[PDB]
């Protein structure tokens, strides 16, 4: 990424953390 905010990282990573449900 370029420069995302604090919660901007979190709202994408939640998806990567899942990859089952919460895909």
Q: How far apart are CA 18 and CA 15, in angstroms?
A: 5
Q: How far apart are CA 2 and CA 22, in angstroms?
A: 24
CB 11 within 8 A of CB 4: no
Report CA Rg, the chain.
10
DSSP-derived letter for residue 17 is: H
Q: Which residue has the tokens 């919660």?
A: 7
Q: Which residue has the tokens 């899942």?
A: 18
User: For the chain, what is the total number of helices (H) and then of strands (E)?
Assistant: 1, 0
Which of 22, 21, 2 is closest to 11 using CA atoms? 22
Instruction: Tell me which residue has tokens 């953390």.
Output: 17
CA distance 18 to 3: 23
Experimentally, how was this structure solved? NMR
């Amino acid at each position: 990424f370029e420069d995302l905010p604090n919660f901007g990282h979190i709202q994408v990573k939640v998806f990567n953390h899942g990859e089952h449900i919460h895909h």
